[model samples]
Structures are given as structure tokens and as C-alpha cells.
Target: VDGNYSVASNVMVPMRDGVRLAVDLYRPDADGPVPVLLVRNPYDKFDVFLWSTQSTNWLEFVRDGYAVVIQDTRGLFASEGEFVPHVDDEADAEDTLSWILEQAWCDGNVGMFGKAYLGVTQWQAAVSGVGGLKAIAPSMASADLYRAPWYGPGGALSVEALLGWSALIGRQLITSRSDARPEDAADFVQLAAILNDVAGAASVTPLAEQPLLGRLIPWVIDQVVDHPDNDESWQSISLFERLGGLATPALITAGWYDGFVGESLRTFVAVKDNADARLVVGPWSHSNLTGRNADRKFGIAATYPIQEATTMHKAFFDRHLRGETDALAGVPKVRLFVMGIDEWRDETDWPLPDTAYTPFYLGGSGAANTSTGGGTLSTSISGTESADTYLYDPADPVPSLGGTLLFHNGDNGPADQRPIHDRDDVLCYSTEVLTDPVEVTGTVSARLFVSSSAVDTDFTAKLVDVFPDGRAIALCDGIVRMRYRETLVNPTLIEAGEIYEVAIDMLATSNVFLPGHRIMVQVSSSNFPKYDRNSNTGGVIAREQLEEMCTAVNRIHRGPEHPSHIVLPIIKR
Candidate 1:
């Protein structure tokens, strides 16, 4: 056989609604009812340019005596139907799985594996509790699309990511639309031109009218504007709410800097009790998961332990789908690549049992603005009351440096934060140079007794590791929209001078603050395009008028009564 496998090109797989999805089947030459490995994604099934060149050795599955099915998601590429992202994945995937089980080449066992949208499809299908779904290997997938992935901790829209993703999918949509209507060549050409200039489109006011994307991807607009809260649209597509009942085994791969890392860990913790689940978090960003990031390079061991991601999936499927019990005998349940130390650690649980949650109090003189200010992070709370105040101008919002970013062109991972930290609007609080190494290895959060002059605004918090050279590297950061402070679904504007205890979930991270390095936190009002800037007009988010930009005086208080502090998941060595 050709390359030890037989290929079936562009086979139509029928869904329950009679929609035929374009699927390509690759089966081993010696296959006799071999287990199936399915990869369903919105990205074109035949588009191997990126995946083949970048990640995973997919062809290895066919050589390993497994049948591989690659299908373009419904309404994408050759698949029939209108393309709606995330909504129809469950039904479509379940239907596809049923079709695969009926095939003579299938051995009544199926495993799904992919990254991003492909990975999300696995979760959608798994949650349906469809029979024959033995296992899934999802890499860097979001369980809750509305939270963290698409939206920030406090209902802040992920502007850059949404725009970038819109442009990417917009290209595909243009291609399909153009192909369908050859006479509409001029329209497709215009759409393509707009997509090329998505950076400009992103600058449009009232994000709801995102010129290019509003017309190209109405759903993108709908997701950003119409559904700011966890409404019916988000609830229906959320995998987090459905994970508790999932019985299919899962092997989730995530990155410390990946946008979905928080949800990936949350999914593992959610399903660990009911399902056989394993998690591996590397010191990587969304696209790069091999220890090598744009700002820093974690040594060779930071790479994936297996030959490739696909090979790891093969082992997982062998254990679950093929009934090869010893396939993953020695694999740990939880593996985390600890940054700063540049090493990996295996744990029996998601949040390590030995974690010591310690609080570092934020104490400072009244002027803790910029890196030059005298702000101190101490273990002891001060008896004297003091506060820091700064004017946050929406026009001069803080630029996003290195952190957990999605599809933005700006820097991601641990990068120098001097540019952002130098701004007077940013309050920098740091501990003295550490005499001993401090290892922080889990979720990070900050409690701030804050008050803003405007009715509504946003407070952003970033955890940094300042080296002896003064190079401040960001570990994790989060923002809390003042109005949505209490809950994401509910919104209540703040009183101008009243202090409110706001909890900012700065996402999760693992890093060791080496001896001589200072543990620092930078507090600011905005982290711009990475998150949409708050207009400060006490108006609706994502739909604010351009003229609604109100400059606000923000204050952060610390004392015996208002002891604002950041809690770190410290691991005692």
C-alpha cells in the first residue's frame, strides 16, 4: 500500500440533519477493524501546510495501525451548512462519530485529538456522552469560551485576540463565499482587502460595529457585543458546566502562557473525580508549547516528552481505545513545567497538595506610581493607613507587554515590562531583593481595596519577577471591571469615593523567584488592545461611545483596616 496506508479523499459523512461533511479517511494497510482517531476542525481538512510544518506528526497514526479521519467542520470548506462557531459542534461531532462507528474499518472504538478549535470539538463530542468515544487528547482548549479565552476575568472583551481570530476565519469565509458565488468576485475581493487591514478595523469605535468583521463574521460581533455576560449563547456552548458528568478519559495538554491554561486546569480538576484525566502544562504560549517562547527559552527538557503531540495521543488512545492497559503505565497524572527553575515536576493532583497560600501585603507611601515610587510588598501589615492615587486616561492606556495573550501581535510570555511599568498611571509594588528563592506554583490572585473617581472603570494587576539587572518579567496578570466586581452576570457601578474590596483573579502560573530577584506587582487601569479599554462612563461595555472616554483618578488603599494584598500559591522547598 502507498506509504503503509490507503487514503480515501473527500468522502461525504452524513449528519442527522442530512448535512454532508467533507471527510478524508486514512487507514492502515494491515488494518482489520482498527481503532479510529478523528480530528474534526473548522480549519480546512486538507490544509496540512501549517500543522504538518509546525506541530504533531499526524501521519504516524496511520503507520501505527490506526484509521485516521479528518473532517472539515459543518459549514466550513466542503461541509454543508451555515458556519456558526462553537454552537453546532456537539451535534455535528456526535453524528460524525456515529458514522465512523458504522464503518467497516472501525473496531467500535474511537479517539479524538487536536489543538484549539479542533481540541474544543473533542470536548463538545465527549460531553454528548456518545458511545464509542473512548478517549480525547485536547491541547490548549477552552472549556468556557466566554470566560478567560474570549472574555477576561471581569467581562473585559479580548479585543486583539477576537480581531486576530476574526481575520483568520474571515479569510476562510471569504474563500468559501467566493467559491460559492463566482459572480460575487468583486465582493470577495473587497472583503479580502478589509481582512488584510484588520488592524484598522480593530480601531473602530463601539466594537459592535467592527466595520470589516461586523459584515464578515456577525457571530463574532454578536459574541463580543450582544453577549457580554454569561447569557444563553455562552451557557449553551460552555464545556465547563458539562464536564462533571463526562466519563470519557482525557489527556489535556496546556501551556503556562497559553490563553486557555486556566480553563484547561479547571477542566482537569472538574472531571478528575468522574473521568480518568491527565494534564501536562508546559512553559509555553498558545502557539508555542515546546518551552521556547519569544522572550525566553526554557532548556531542552521543556519540550514535549514524546516524539510529537500526535505520538502522545497515540499512546493515550492505545491505552484507552485499544485496551492496551500498560500503554501509559508510568505517565504521571499531572505534569507541570515550572518556569524560572526551567524544569518539570510531576504531581498526583492539579493544585499540588503541599501548596502554601501566602499573602504579600501591599504597603507604600501615598505615591506608589511608576517603578520609581516607594512601594513595598511585605509579609507584615502596616498599622498606618496610606493610599496611592494616579490619573488613568483612556487615551493614554497602558500598553500590553508580556503575559498570557492569544492572537495579538504584541509580545506574549515572560518579556521585559519596563515600558509598561514606567508609566505614572501604573503603581508598582515590589518586595526587597529576595535572599532565598521563592517558588510560586499555582493560581495567583490580588485583593484590592480600591476606589475610582468615575462611576465605572477597570483595575489591572500583574505579577512580575524583577531580576538583579532590573529586567521585570511578567508571570501572570488579570483585570477586574469595577461594575462586574461582584459577579460576571451582574453589573453595578462603583461609588466615587467608597472603598470596595475587589478580588482580581490574576490567572494561574508557576515560577521560581530566584535569589536576588524581587517579587513585584504592577497595578494599572488598562492593559490595552490585549483587553478592551474601559471608557469609564458607567456605560455598557463593548458598546461604549468613543466620546465616553472619561479620565478617572484611581486609588489603592493599604493598612490594618484595608490590608490589600496578593495571595501567592507558595511552595515551600
Candidate 2:
């Protein structure tokens, strides 16, 4: 591991369009060609950063008898092109692979590996028909940015993640002098300067002094303010339609708290059904899937086991890319970390076939009210019930306490539901302590049979794991603007007080309900910073009148007639 490897710095790789991209090549100082591990990323490639600062694993691949090629994606670092994100990933990947195959040190074989944006680039590149790409180990990524957490099911803004990502990208454009286009970079820096102030009443101009920010920030704002739907802009970057075309062997690592969890799992399932794929769902935040943490909470049997999971990743890559007969040969197709029990389990596939589709009904008397007495969860409708009601005022809209909120830099923090949950405006419900262990893994849906007081309103559902000691931890959650209940693409406003069944996707989760623990579901009108508040008064996405506020009652009916319920993929021994 300590052996020195001869590496070339800043090697220019010419693209099809005649644009030269900067690349760093690491190869064994030997007589023959070596297998290549290609990583294409928009993130700065010159950092020479490693999984651990001690070992340049990217370089270690060369030390381990394989060649490593790290290239700055087009319009990033030293690459040239108008940066279009995923739109150009495929073709660029193909061109890079073609060039690598013709290189003197390449063995005509290549594999891709990286996390987040890097992981996604690998998936997009494979779709470009790269002849040398034999396999990929994409961790903590999403195949389709549109279907990802950045945008809702139909085209709603993934408020927290999207803004945060935009800011980070904005910063990159600001700092990267060699690769940044002067105008674009200037716009980006300007937008970054006051990006977060959009929702606030503050009026600020885009930065003018920082040319890089000034150039790139405007583009970020254009993305958010313009494409408010799943239109052409989304289609241009979406990987949804061509997933079945991905035939390369893939090892997909997803995290529960990772913003792209749903997309990660869906991509794995789609690819697995289409070809061969391995999936892992870990108890991790967006980062730290590779085992480093200040708490040291990961091990074989720890609450957040990262090392073993990463070892699994290493095995997958070694077996497929290095032709090694490793432990990954007969490994189960799906592995998930169950939160309640804080343990990991392996299954033949996701949505474990043995799960029972259990329905937990939403019970309330006939009126829509937010009082503790009005909302309840039962197996059957609690007889004829009324609706639950609350007031949504956009002027002083609910503040985002947790879920997803983009901070200045690139970081996604954990759950902080204490403030929001305590609000009387947000309704909460829970199940009695389970006498036995109950494992539920998959998507959760809440079918609500009711009407809103306003022309357009929103219903948010959150699934939480409540410990015996009363710590309510959020798992997965979703919201549905009443107008788009039936479809995210089309909006249909329900008549005030009319009874309609609206299905709220509570989101997906992989967790175990240990003995003495209860499964809780919270239904609220707003998730705040996680999502923009619906100004009770129906209007466009951003424009909200300060005076529009309405108090409406919410009622949940549970009985043979109304039968409102929450569906969970429950697995029991």
C-alpha cells in the first residue's frame, strides 16, 4: 500500500467538440497497460482528495495495479464547454471513455465510482454507450434529477435540497477561475450573494464585484424561477425513460437520510430488473457513508454501521472490475439498515416479497379540527367523523425547522421536528407500543377523504419512529398541494367542503419497530423551510398576498363507509 506510483498531472484529454479537459492520471510504473477506473465529476478534480487524507485511493488504484483517471467535467476546473449538468454527462463520458481506450496505459476496460454528483455522473455516462465502461459503483446518488428530492413528484421545488445545491454550484462557479466562463461565473457569484434572501422581504441586487458569482448566480436563479413544472428543462436532464438501457453491472449505495434516497432506491430497482444490480440502504446522512464520524457510531453492530457497508462496496467493485472471486458473488440483491432496531438486514430484493400490506385508518369525528381530540389512527374508521381544520397564513408562514433546508455551504443536516411538531397547527398521531417487532420497508401512502377550506391547500404526512423514551425521529415524509392531489402535472382544485380522497405519499422508509416502540404519523398543513408555505390564498408558486389567511377544519373518518388509512409494507416474523 505504501509503494510509490508514477502519476502524470494535468494531462489534457481532447473532447469531440475539440474542447480539452484537464485530467490527472495515475498508473503503475510498469511495462504493460492497466485496467482503468474513470471518475468524471463537476467538483474540482485538482484537490487530489482521498476517502481518507492519508491514502489517495484514487491514486491507490494505480498502486493496486490499475490506472486511475480523474477528469474535470466540462465547464468545471480546466474543462471547456457551457456547463449543462447532466445534459452533457452522457456524451462527455462516452468521449472520455473513447479517449481512454485509445490511451497507451489503458487495457480497454474501465469502471466508474464516486458519490453524490460524482456517482450520478457515472450513471449518466454509462447511458452514452461507453464501450470501455464495464461496471460502476455509484454511491449516494440519483439517476434522475427531476424525480429526485430537488423536485416534487410532479415538479414542485425540492425547496431545501435544490436551493442548497444551487448555492454550492454557485460557489464553484465563483471560485473556479480557469474553467469558469467570465459572464456565467459573474452571474453565479451575484446570485450566490443573495440567493437565500429570495423568500424574505429583503430586496437586494445580484453581486457585481464578484464577477464569477455575478455570471453563474443568475443562471441558478433562472432555473428556480423559470421551470416550475416538469417541462422541457426537466426532460433534458431526466434519466427516467432510458433506465432500462443501462446494462452495466452496478453497485448502488443509498442512505435513509440522503436527499436522493427515493431516487437511489428506484434507480437500483429499475436497473436490477433491467439488468444486474446490487443495492444498499444505510443509516446515514447525505455524507459519511464511508465510515468517518466524530461520534464513532459505526461498526459491524453499531447504530450506524459504515465500515462493513463500505467493505461491501469495495467487494462489489473488486469482483466486477478486478475480476476477483470475492464475497460479493452470492450476496443478496438488497441490504437495508433498519432504524428503530439500529441493525442491518439482507434481503433477496427490495419491498421484501413477504411484507403484508397493512392499512392504518385515519379516525376522527365529522369536523376538520387540529385538536388532539379530532385526529386518530385505527384499523377501522372511528365511525362517522368530521374534518380537522387549521389556518395557513403565508405572511408569517411556518418556518422550516428541519427536514431539508439548504445552508450556505454544501451540507444537509438531520431532523429537528421539535419546533414544528410542538405547533398546534401541525397535527400528530401515534400507534400504541408494539408488543412484537414490526419491520416496515417501502413507500407509505396516506389516503385522506376530505375537502379544504381554501381554493388550494396542502396536506403533509410524516412517518416518525417514536422510542419508548419519547424521542420522535423522522423517517420519510411527503406533501400534496390539494390542487395537485390527483396529479402533479395537472392541477384540479376541489370544491370547498366537498369530500374527495387525496393520497399523500408519506414517502419511503426502511425501519424496524422494536418492542416498546410505536410508529407515529404526523399530518400537518406545512413543513416550513422543508417546503414553501402555501399562502391559503391560491396563487402562483412564489407570489403570496400578505393578508390571505384562512382557518379550516380537518376531519378524518374511519368506518366501513369512509375507510381512510395509511398503508405500510409491514414484515413480521
* Candidate 2 local lDDT, residue 477: 77
Error of 1 at 381 (Å): 1.6
Give the best candidate by TM-score: 1
TM-scores vs. true structure, each candidate: 0.95, 0.86
- Please, what are the lDDT tens digits per residue for candidate 1 over residues 1-573? 535988888999888989899999999997469899999978888886655433468788888888999999988888888888888899998999999999999999999887777788888989877789999888878778887578866778887778777777876776756346653456556555545554445556777877656777788877666787767778888888878877878988887777877777787888889878988888777766566655577888976555645666777888998889888887788888888888888889878889998989999775789999988999889667999999988777887776877665433588788877678999999999999999999888999999989998999999999988878888989999888899888687889989999999888999999999999999989987778888888876677767767899999998999999999999987
Summed over model 2, clashes come to 51
State the lDDT of candidate 2 residue by residue for 1-573, as single tens digits: 334577688799888889888888877777677788888867777775633231124444565677788888888777777775576787788889999999998877788888778888887878877767878878778887766756666234565555556667776766666565647655665555546553431111111122333244554445554455666777777776788877788888777766677778778877887666888777666643443333223355533344454455556657766678764776778878776666678888876878787888776544323324445666655566444555555444445543333342113223534545555566666676789888888877787676666777777777776667656666777777777777665576667777778788655787787889777777766665456566555566554334434545544434566776789888876
